[PDB]
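Internal tracking record. Fields below are filled automatically when a chain is submitted to the structure queue. Please do not edit lines marked as system-generated. If the sequence contains nonstandard residues, flag them in the REMARKS field before resubmitting.
Queue: standard
Priority: normal
Entity type: single polypeptide chain
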Amino acid sequence: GSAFNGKWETESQEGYEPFCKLIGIPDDVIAKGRDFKLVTEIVQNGDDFTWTQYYPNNHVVTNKFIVGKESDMETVGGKKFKGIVSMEGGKLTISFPKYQQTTEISGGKLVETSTASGAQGTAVLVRTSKKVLV
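SYSTEM-GENERATED OUTPUT FOLLOWS
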């Protein structure tokens, strides 16, 4: 592992609305979820990750991947894909269908950056989560 291990909860969030609008999330869904604090559970055994996100209404999204190896994954919206996750300097990069995701532990916090690109330009969501099982 091991720095990612644990349960984390969103503490800070920037760019939520422009990012969700760019990747095509409906306006009312954006509005209803704007104050929700996403909890993330991670089990990291070396390159082997199990990454669980607890979305609203008991929507649990779990991705199991091995860094550097083709892995079956799913998007938040439920679309299945096969991907190869990379890591460089403690930062994971997951190349999702709709956006690039980079994730790292910085200053003891889980920092997750989603980068999307379209007509109006780039939109970036940065989520920072604190450990809630300490």
